[PDB]
Amino acid sequence: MKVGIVGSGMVGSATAYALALLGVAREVVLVDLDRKLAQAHAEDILHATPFAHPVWVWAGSYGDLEGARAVVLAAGVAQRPGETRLQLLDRNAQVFAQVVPRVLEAAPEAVLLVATNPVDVMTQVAYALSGLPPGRVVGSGTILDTARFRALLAEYLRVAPQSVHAYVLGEHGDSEVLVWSSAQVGGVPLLEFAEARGRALSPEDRARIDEGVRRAAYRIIEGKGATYYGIGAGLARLVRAILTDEKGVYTVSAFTPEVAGVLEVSLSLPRILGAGGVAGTVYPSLSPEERAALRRSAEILKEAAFALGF
Amino acid sequence: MKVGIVGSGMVGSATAYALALLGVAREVVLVDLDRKLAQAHAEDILHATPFAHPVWVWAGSYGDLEGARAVVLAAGVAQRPGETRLQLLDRNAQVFAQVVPRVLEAAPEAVLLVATNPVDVMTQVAYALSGLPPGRVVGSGTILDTARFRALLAEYLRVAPQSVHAYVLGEHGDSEVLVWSSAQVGGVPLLEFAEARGRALSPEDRARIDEGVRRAAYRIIEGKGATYYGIGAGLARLVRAILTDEKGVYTVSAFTPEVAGVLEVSLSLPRILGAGGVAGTVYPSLSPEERAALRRSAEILKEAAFALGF
Amino acid sequence: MKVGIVGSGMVGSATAYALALLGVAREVVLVDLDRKLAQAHAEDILHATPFAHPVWVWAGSYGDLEGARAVVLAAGVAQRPGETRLQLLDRNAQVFAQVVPRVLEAAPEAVLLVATNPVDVMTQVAYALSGLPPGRVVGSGTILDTARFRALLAEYLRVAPQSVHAYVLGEHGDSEVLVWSSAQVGGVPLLEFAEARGRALSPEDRARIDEGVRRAAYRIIEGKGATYYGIGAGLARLVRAILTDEKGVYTVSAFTPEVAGVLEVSLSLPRILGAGGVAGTVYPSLSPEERAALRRSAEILKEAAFALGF
Amino acid sequence: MKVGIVGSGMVGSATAYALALLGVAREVVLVDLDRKLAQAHAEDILHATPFAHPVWVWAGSYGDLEGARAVVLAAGVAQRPGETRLQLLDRNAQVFAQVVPRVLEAAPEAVLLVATNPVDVMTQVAYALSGLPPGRVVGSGTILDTARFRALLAEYLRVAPQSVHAYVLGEHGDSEVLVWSSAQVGGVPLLEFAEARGRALSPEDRARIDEGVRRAAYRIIEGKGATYYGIGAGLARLVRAILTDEKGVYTVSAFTPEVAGVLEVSLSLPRILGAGGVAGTVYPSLSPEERAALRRSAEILKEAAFALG
Numbered sequence A, B, C: 001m002k003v004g005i006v007g008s009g010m011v012g013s014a015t016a017y018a019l020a021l022l023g024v025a026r027e028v029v030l031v032d033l034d035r036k037l038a039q040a041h042a043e044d045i046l047h048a049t050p051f052a053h054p055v056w057v058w059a060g061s062y063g064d065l066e067g068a069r070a071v072v073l074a075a076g077v078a079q080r081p082g083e084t085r086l087q088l089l090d091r092n093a094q095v096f097a098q099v100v101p102r103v104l105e106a107a108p109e110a111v112l113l114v115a116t117n118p119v120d121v122m123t124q125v126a127y128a129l130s131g132l133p134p135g136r137v138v139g140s141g142t143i144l145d146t147a148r149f150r151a152l153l154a155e156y157l158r159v160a161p162q163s164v165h166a167y168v169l170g171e172h173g174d175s176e177v178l179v180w181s182s183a184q185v186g187g188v189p190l191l192e193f194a195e196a197r198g199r200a201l202s203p204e205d206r207a208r209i210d211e212g213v214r215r216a217a218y219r220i221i222e223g224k225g226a227t228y229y230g231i232g233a234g235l236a237r238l239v240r241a242i243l244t245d246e247k248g249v250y251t252v253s254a255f256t257p258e259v260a261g262v263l264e265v266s267l268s269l270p271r272i273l274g275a276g277g278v279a280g281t282v283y284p285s286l287s288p289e290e291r292a293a294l295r296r297s298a299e300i301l302k303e304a305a306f307a308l309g310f
Numbered sequence D: 001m002k003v004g005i006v007g008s009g010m011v012g013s014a015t016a017y018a019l020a021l022l023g024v025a026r027e028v029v030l031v032d033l034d035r036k037l038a039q040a041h042a043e044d045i046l047h048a049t050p051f052a053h054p055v056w057v058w059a060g061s062y063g064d065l066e067g068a069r070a071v072v073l074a075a076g077v078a079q080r081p082g083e084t085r086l087q088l089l090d091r092n093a094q095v096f097a098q099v100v101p102r103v104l105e106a107a108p109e110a111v112l113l114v115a116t117n118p119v120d121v122m123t124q125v126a127y128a129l130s131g132l133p134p135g136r137v138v139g140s141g142t143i144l145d146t147a148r149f150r151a152l153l154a155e156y157l158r159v160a161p162q163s164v165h166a167y168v169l170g171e172h173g174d175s176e177v178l179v180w181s182s183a184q185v186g187g188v189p190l191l192e193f194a195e196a197r198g199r200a201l202s203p204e205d206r207a208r209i210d211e212g213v214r215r216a217a218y219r220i221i222e223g224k225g226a227t228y229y230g231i232g233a234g235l236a237r238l239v240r241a242i243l244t245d246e247k248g249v250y251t252v253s254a255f256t257p258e259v260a261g262v263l264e265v266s267l268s269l270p271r272i273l274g275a276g277g278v279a280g281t282v283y284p285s286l287s288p289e290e291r292a293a294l295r296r297s298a299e300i301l302k303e304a305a306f307a308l309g
């Protein structure tokens, strides 16, 4: 099986590396206008393979994507000095204008996995451009936020992260909604479990955890300018779910007909992920307060998309 | 890094195999009355390791349990077609009067993991004979029924069982309690999930799932004489939780001071499992109907234990 | 991807279990005339899945094999009292005469992986009956003996087995050929490695290791009546090589136009294994003595095939 | 078990990533002078772990190396485009005079795994500074070159590199020695295998593979600025071998009393790697041309090191 990655910067290359070391696919192809860059990463990654799993890793053009079951779009351009957010958006939206049709020409059955920030808008862009059914185009969304939510809650409760089933919904960013109400730990509603552990989730404890999720990427950016290792592994896990027809639930971004009363918007909800992309979308049980917050997040996103021309 | 298994029969050897396939422990010692059988199982599994994970599997005497962090008790008779697990109690209680002290003498710090049926009462028997702290003696309990419930719902919904959150409490047997009330997929109550998936779960569908879980062992025993693959993997998973001090949350059996008004009885509840056995116990809020079912189940077990003086 | 297993005895079910715990394939289908037997193994293994990887395991008919990329043939019939082993072969050959065309009817592009003993002759039978090209029908052959040879050499040299590259060729059985001459350890010719290690291999060392390989199965049989764990994982590994298009080398059995002067015989040689089955057959460097032994092994298999009518 | 990484730049961080992805160790600590860098990397990798294996990755001081079974040394400058590894020598030797004592102060029983270039000389430097037995100081050596050789052969032959047995000895650098003479696939000498597969390796083909291996780092550095993915995984593998007492055989660098007639030089040969480092060294028979080249390699390293030394 073959996976494509368009954009061979730190995010695309870290994804390719995680795919290789975890042996997710037999073939991994990197595409980037900076040909020498994609080649250099493909070569560096190929050289890791004898220490792990056999993977044909190479750099090529869109034609090399033929047969790809998933293609990761990590093709965000580098922000110029004093360019501002909205300008960057346009440039990136225009890159996608060139990338999407050329990917789908070579790999007409590919699931598209958008990584480019802001993921929700870019997922909307990719969806619109693709002309594909809504489930075929997915963005990394809140996948890392959700994992981080579980990790912090797990530390708080003194249990394994794998036992904590909690979600982050909506925008990958400031308006993300931590869903406390219907969270569970090893089958136990979170409230009953916290009590069993001598923990009352005070509003101040939850506030602590909330900020911990929201601010996570901040220290990484501050310390080295960009994050890629975390997201690389997250994308590799999503690719695995697609390629293996897993039908496991992930919080990823996708075009959504209606959510919390807002219409036609791309954002994160728990979704069943398999061979054709999203196999079905789940709408979690929310408290009135969480619903209001999701509504606000969707409104923020809808408006940001509309403003771009989408 | 060392685990012991007492009883290298179908259940004991499948456990060793799963441990090896899942790369759980560096050392697995098989202790059987029949040394040749255990040695054969050990060599057979050893020949599997080149195709999985490096593991030293070998056959020894009880003394060879020295240093084991966990010891699985899988010795004793299994139920035949017309028999319930409770009807094995007197035969297997005599066996544990021999097994338990021999394990305690060779490996006094080992967490005991009980597989022998009826697993709940045999857990009680092991706890009583061991003289160990309550949390250090754990029975597999409903870990297998929970997996069955999740797998059957997975088949029904076409969602991977990792994302199907439902469990079984009480007796590993005819009086077990399926906890429909809190069952959940992607943060949505199970029945609402199935509804939205156009796969609504009618009372007849639920009755069918229930029989599928409750009579699983009986069907398998009818078809092939014994069950062992499912429990094998479950035991390997619990062994991993102990070895890694995972603090994962599982529905396993252990001595319970009070549950649903019944005193001093071993049965399954959601518990935190780690390096010293049970680290904590949860008493979930059940539906009124489930709560009453759990009471009858605890009452059944307390009665059976009491008849032998446990 | 989908894998089928025809024959749900201990070998078939152990293979399915290894496939499931290792997450080699998304779908595993067990097919056996004894429908209740297959169903019982399929349920038992399905219940293991929530502890490891999502796999749809079920029991079905040949029709259910549609789209399977590999099908494991472990369909051997049970010996009757007084029945000769030759008479047993006859009955197994008749079984294969039914199994092979029904499998291929449902999964025309499937690689057939023969597990039934004697594996070389049954590989020959499957190949003749299939009507496929020789690379499409592979038998487990000496996969376990090769691994065993490496383990014993590794033990002798005090090195990791993964660093030992040596092969057992020919018949899976008494006429097996250990290739000492061209074996290497970490890139170094075996004799130089041992010499450097200050452990030159004497005739006595080679004889002991030879017996260690050549009687390994007998020892397991004598203790528990049949082997299945080892070959289950071995078969699972070969299935994985096929499904991932690994192009790795394995000593597996396949029809061979000419080897050591003998014509048209199935026996084990190091073969490149991937999507279509064997992608190439390697003929290792042999000493006169090794070549003489291989010729004899080939002659023995050729005579047995001919005797059976193949 | 715990592993430490000193130098949390591209190599150190990629090593941590590979360790996390392969589930090699339960605990990985990153140490750097730039604490914010190490912290950013550790948190970035920590966020990957939910999608791979439970691993506690964090950034700490030298003191925090305590209990580490192995410490990877990846601190120091890397080569700029068009720069040789030997040109890093004076600068990185100065780095190691600070690094090495500090590591052994916190973790006296750790096997040292040297990545910093030029690896062979740096391995020699670490050995001299350490006071440890020669086997406890191991350089990644030609482990990467060997992998490159196998990978390029894999692409040529269409065979998984696991099944291509070829290696590189000597300097991790321009004088390295590709050992064509004993390369094998499935027990068949490489050239005979290739011929029988319908793809004979001509002299021109072999020369291209040589350039492919020998100059791989210069190309990658021209194209993206640094190499790190290849060595990251190779270091994770070597760390796994140490932690697990694997006794796997790898072409790694270590102090060598005599090789090809040259005395007291650190360079790569096939060695057994386990707990406590190098368990033994093999001196394979080489073609006359390979042995002369290995000799040259040893002489070059010894002379380059002589400057202190």
Ligand SMILES: NC(=O)c1ccc[n+]([C@@H]2O[C@H](COP(=O)([O-])OP(=O)(O)OC[C@H]3O[C@@H](n4cnc5c(N)ncnc54)[C@H](O)[C@@H]3O)[C@@H](O)[C@H]2O)c1
Binding pocket: B006, B007, B008, B009, B010, B011, B012, B031, B032, B033, B034, B037, B074, B075, B076, B077, B078, B079, B088, B095, B098, B099, B114, B115, B116, B117, B119, B140, B141, B144, B172, B226, B227, B228, B231
């Ligand atoms: N979910 C569950 O907990 C679960 C599931 C399946 C089976 N089981 C149970 O596990 C038990 C074992 O079933 P089995 O199929 O493996 O039986 P086997 O296949 O008959 O295994 C029993 C082995 O224990 C050995 N043995 C007996 N007494 C011993 C002693 N004092 N010391 C050492 N070894 C001893 C025997 O020699 C025998 O090999 C049964 O009680 C069965 O009901 C439990």
Ligand SMILES: NC(=O)c1ccc[n+]([C@@H]2O[C@H](COP(=O)([O-])OP(=O)(O)OC[C@H]3O[C@@H](n4cnc5c(N)ncnc54)[C@H](O)[C@@H]3O)[C@@H](O)[C@H]2O)c1
Binding pocket: D006, D007, D008, D009, D010, D011, D012, D031, D032, D033, D034, D037, D074, D075, D076, D077, D078, D079, D088, D095, D098, D099, D114, D115, D116, D117, D118, D119, D140, D141, D144, D172, D226, D227, D228, D231
């Ligand atoms: N096969 C190989 O052996 C191989 C392959 C690739 C790179 N390398 C080498 O590895 C080294 C690291 O490369 P890099 O790309 O990561 O460089 P970076 O990306 O420049 O990494 C270097 C880090 O070392 C840190 N450092 C310096 N002195 C320190 C000290 N006293 N204590 C703690 N940290 C200190 C620096 O702060 C810096 O973050 C280079 O020498 C490079 O040539 C070797």
